[PDB]
Amino acid sequence: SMKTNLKGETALHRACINNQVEKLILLLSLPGIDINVKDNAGWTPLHEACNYGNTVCVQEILQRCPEVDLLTQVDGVTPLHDALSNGHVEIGKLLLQHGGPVLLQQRNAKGELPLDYVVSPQIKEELFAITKIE
Amino acid sequence: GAKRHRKVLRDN
């Protein structure tokens, strides 16, 4: 595996926390890189980009990693939970446009669905309307 | 009220 800090965060995690898009693009081009790598608690780089609202980092992951797992979880918290709980609606739209409606069905350990964090009925409609249809 | 990720500290 790659080098980690004390939290188990790799350079991929750090780029996604720090919004280092150019660094991220290089790292995503490395052979044998695992975009789904987990830190010590289990969070992925995609979780970090979604939690912090780093929309361009999310876009780059989704466009450069066909094998990214959008259902990875810690305590049931998926990337879409992370994004919507922190109000990052644009990231939520990107995730749903890539992953389809299975993302909307995931309950976290507290029994929350990702749309439970969206108060506006009209934002909920826009999120559903952009969701990939398979 | 921004929810941040819980972390685990470990140095192997």
CA A15 to chain centre: 13
CATH of the domain spanning A11-130, picked from 3.40.50.80, 1.10.10.10, 3.40.50.620, 1.25.40.20: 1.25.40.20
- C-beta atoms of A74 and B5 within 8 A: yes
Task: State the Cα–Cα distance between residues A62 and A70, nearest whole angstrom.
Answer: 9
Nearest CA among A28, A103, A38, A19 for reference residue A65:
A28
**Closest alpha carbon to A46 in A20, A18, A77, A69:** A69
Are the CB atoms for A110 and A119 separated by under 8 Å?
no
**Cross-chain Cβ contact B7/A39 below 8 Å:** yes
The C-alpha of A8 sits at a distance from chain B's nearest C-alpha, in angstroms, of 7
List of chain A residues whose C-beta atoms are within 8 Å of the C-beta of residue B2: 86
